[PDB]
Symmetry: C2
């Protein structure tokens, strides 16, 4: 009845939802559940409280957020006079290695009647699959399926990576007084997101290094661990030492290494893109884009996974409520999902550009944020709601209005 | 009595398995667990010949019998206006199994036999400390720049950059030849293709080892990415194979032709051939032994790498039992036993690489006689098991001519 091209958080959450309402689902993915452990580190993004609520509703709360998650954000922002402050999440967020998490979802879906076809799907296959199901949904960007959905230029200002990425899971990093993410900014050099992450060997810490192009931190995206582990580790230690010291001071150098293996490191760049939420094929049938295919987001704000889960839930509801899946159905869908998903893109793109250029109104925001606990709490919890973050950041007047609410 | 092995692979695990049979203490240092192999990008697609499977049988690690999963000869194709098509038998079957299935099988066998694993990445700085923890430390991984510890032998290393732009992948949709066999296809001045019947996740598949000449009509296959556009890559592949390697291309079903399991079934790049000292003396005065890829990095064109790794592991294994002091004299005993075959594999591969691009008169004359004599083709094919015998033939033009004269 419903065909899903691609597993991942979007496809599996959609499949699990539809399966609760006795809808026939088939998922097309290339990797078997028992073949995930050896994959290179996937999307290191955390799942927020709202996504966790969906997991509870979908009966896939394998690793509870209160036991395995984190409860707020520590903030570090560097320079000659560094700022150190904290904001609470109202309910815990949680990061679990996707190499453990995705197979869990796949096994839960299969056990509940969801069918799996373990085969690689490319653009040429889409027309044939569209005639096999009432609706075809594609949520994976791999095998170049992203090219099927037209790029929206008005929502895609960047054409190349804005940061040089070095993302890894590490051992030997002590936990802060409270289990929390640390967001560290080295002015003109880079961002670090430290995320407590459950992986193979237990609780480790993810280091998401969003390094500026041409900065003192860019080398970390180009130096290979497998070329010389000691040299990589030494370089990491000194770079964190001077750029992200609030994280660095909790590192034990004797224990500092990757959490499991050299597979726990991912280096490169992400081109942010916002695309059409639907595509019309040659046979006249409409297919629906979900998750990464509709929006490729830079991981700095950790929005990707939460947007995938959110849109999957809405699309699931809309599949039940409608019987004709055409342009009108597509309109209904976008009306419900677009704002939050688009705002996650807009808030991420704004933040990347604001961090590099450092505009007057943004610097004034960082100052009031550091000096107001109540503002830090609100800003932190609003990571769960990117639409209301864009309500704050969309204009200099809105930034100023929000700042005046506190001091 | 107590041996430390840096790196797994065929070299490390064969050595480990050998030593455990004689109840010596074995520890292997690797950064990959057995259950992590299935999700890896494509590894070395080299086949194991009859002498290697013989060692595998002796090590009770013959998981995939040569009869059901192996191949029985080589088809040879040489391109041109009048192509050469000929065949040579192997006396005993060779076998290629995806290393992402084969390596964990070795690891599980070694684990179950008392072999210990320390799952860690080893840096050059760690070697001195590790050498003081074991009676002998052996390195066999080419990772972590550990090769730099073993002095490069310039007289045995004529190349300093990759001689070929590589595109290697596991493919479905390629029909088997009348006999289950490797095909070695040569497009004059453009590239070599080694088609290997290989057991992978979904059963029997076919490896395509495309060794493309730099500046040719085939170099583009090593640079165009499958993930950018799968259809464009496969169409390009079908176009290039149809032109340059038609004997393989004729057996391809274009409707099914794709990577065997996933996008991870493809490797592109290059190999820098090198031959290094088989030993190194550290600052603490202790001798460490080099094994497999770290002492000899070979181009995959003749598929010698894995066989040499297995061969040297057996020799080193035997010498470890025969000696109690592991120094320079021990190293001499090892080198005099293992060197000729391992060195001749390097020499023969390098000679072949240069001869295929330059095409000397004595090489073309050899090709002519080989294509018309099955007995010579059979001898040449089976001698893939014996690199030293191949170098007895190819080391000089006089030796090539003598071999041609006894078959003409």
């Amino acid at each position: 009845r419903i065909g899903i091209v691609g597993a991942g958080t979007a496809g599996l959450h959609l499949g699990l939802f539809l399966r609760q309402h006795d809808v026939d689902v088939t998922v097309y993915t290339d990797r078997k559940p028992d073949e995930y452990s050896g994959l290179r580190l996937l999307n290191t993004v955390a799942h927020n409280a709202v996504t966790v609520q969906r997991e509870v509703a979908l009966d896939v709360n394998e690793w509870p957020s209160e036991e395995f998650g984190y409860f707020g954000h520590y903030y570090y922002v560097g320079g000659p006079q560094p700022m150190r402050f904290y904001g609470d999440l109202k309910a815990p967020s949680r990061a679990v290695d996707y190499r453990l998490y995705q197979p869990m979802l796949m096994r839960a879906l299969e056990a509940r009647g969801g069918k799996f076809c373990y085969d690689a799907v490319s653009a040429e296959d889409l027309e044939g699959l569209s005639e096999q199901y009432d609706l075809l949904v594609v949520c994976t960007g791999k095998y170049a399926l992203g090219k099927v959905f037209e790029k929206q230029s008005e929502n895609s200002p960047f054409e190349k990576p804005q940061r040089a990425l070095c993302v890894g899971l590490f051992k030997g990093i002590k936990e802060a007084p409270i289990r929390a993410v640390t967001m560290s900014f080295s002015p003109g050099h880079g961002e670090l997101i430290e995320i407590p992450t459950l992986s193979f060997n237990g609780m480790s810490t993810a280091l998401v290094l969003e390094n500026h192009i041409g900065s003192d931190l860019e080398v970390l995206a180009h130096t290979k661990y497998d070329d010389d582990p000691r040299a990589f580790l030494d370089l990491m230690l000194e770079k964190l030492g001077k750029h992200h010291p609030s994280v660095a001071e909790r590192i034990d150098p004797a224990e500092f290494d990757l959490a499991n293996s050299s597979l726990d490191i991912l280096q490169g760049g992400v081109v942010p893109a916002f695309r059409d939420g639907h595509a019309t094929l040659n046979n006249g049938k409409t297919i629906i884009g979900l998750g990464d295919i509709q929006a490729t987001v830079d991981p700095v704000l950790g929005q990707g996974a939460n947007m995938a889960s959110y849109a999957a839930w809405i699309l699931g509801e809309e599949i039940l409520a409608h019987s004709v899946y055409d342009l009108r159905f597509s309109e209904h869908l976008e009306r419900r999902r677009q704002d939050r998903v688009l705002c996650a893109t807009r808030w991420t793109n704004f933040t990347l550009s604001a961090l590099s250029a450092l505009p007057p109104e943004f610097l004034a925001f960082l100052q009031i944020l550091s000096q107001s606990r109540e503002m830090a709490d609100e800003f932190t919890d609003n990571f769960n709601y990117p639409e209301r973050q864009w309500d704050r950041f969309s204009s200099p007047e809105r930034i100023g209005q929000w700042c005046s609410q506190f001091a």
